Amino acid sequence: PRYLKGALKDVVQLSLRRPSLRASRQRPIISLRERILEFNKRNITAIIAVYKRKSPSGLDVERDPIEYAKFMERYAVGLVILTEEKYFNGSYEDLRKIASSVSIPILMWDFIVKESQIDDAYNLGADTVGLIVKILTERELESLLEYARSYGMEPAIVINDEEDLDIALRIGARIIIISSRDLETLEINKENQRKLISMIPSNVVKVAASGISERNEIEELRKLGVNAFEIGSSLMRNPEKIKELIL
């Protein structure tokens, strides 16, 4: 991984130390990219609902994974499931459980740093994974992207700045997550997010993340070319906000 410090470095040490999992995948690979695109053509708002019990940028929510997933199934273009243990209190089990209960596409969000964590996604039912630029060498990032593709997965590439984005373009990202929230400071910059978005080619699926909270924002960002929307903690709090958000 890259040279790091503080909370980030600590997540990446744990992730490297993280025990693999034995299991057989019992679902098909459902592409997140392809379904975002269907929603666009179908003129339906593409919301990606996140599941997380805890995050550094919210208060803890105790809530049933399955009940949440089954509920979002009626509405969301897909689900993000956190499986990072320390900072997000997530588990592979949340993934397994939800994966056996819904058949919308599932992205596993963790700090992915080695092949075996990709094996776990696959083995557990995840349709795809988040690859984090700020965390990986160009080499590792290219290496794990190829590896995810060997299973049939098309990973999302998560970005914050122009350097991130340039490296996503290097590897030929097909799906990019543009987060406005900095991993370290937790500062949100929507102005920087908008510029990043303007700089991304049309042929690439663009998902805006962090900070989104109302249909007007979603509408403004759609006019700017955004395809789908990762929405987290507020849906954890109030899952039925998504009916409002998809109008």
Other Cβ atoms closer than 10 A to 5: 8
Q: SS3 of 205, please?
A: strand
Q: How far apart are the first and last CA of the chain?
A: 41
The parent domain of residue 26 ranges over 1-247
Instruction: Check residue 183 and give left, alpha or beta (phi > 0: left; psi -120 to 50: alpha).
Output: alpha
The span from the CA of 50 to the CA of 231, in Å, is 6
Q: Which of 94, 92, 158, 146 is nearest to 115 (CA)?
A: 146
The structural domain count of the chain equals: 1
Is residue 214 within 8 A of residue 64, CB to CB? The reply is no
Supply the angle between the helices 138-150 and 162-170 in degrees, to the nearest 10.
50
Of the CA atoms within 13 Å of residue 68, those in its CB half-sphere come to 29
Note whether 211 and 194 are within 8 A (CB). Answer: no
HSE of 153, CA atoms in CB hemisphere, 13 A: 27
- d(CA 179, CA 57) in angstroms, rounded, equals 13
And the tokens for 16?
Answer: 């490297």
Q: What is the CATH number of the domain that holds 124?
A: 3.20.20.70
**Which structural technique was applied?**
X-ray
Instruction: Classify residue 74 as left (phi > 0), alpha (psi -120 to 50) or beta.
Output: alpha
What are the residues whose beta carbons fall under 8 Å from the beta carbon of 30, sequence distance 6 or more?
103, 104, 105, 106, 127
Residue 180: φ, ψ to 5°: -85, -15
169-175-176 Cα angle (round to 5): 65
How far apart CA 65 and CA 51 sit, in angstroms, is 7
Record the resolution, in angstroms.
2.5
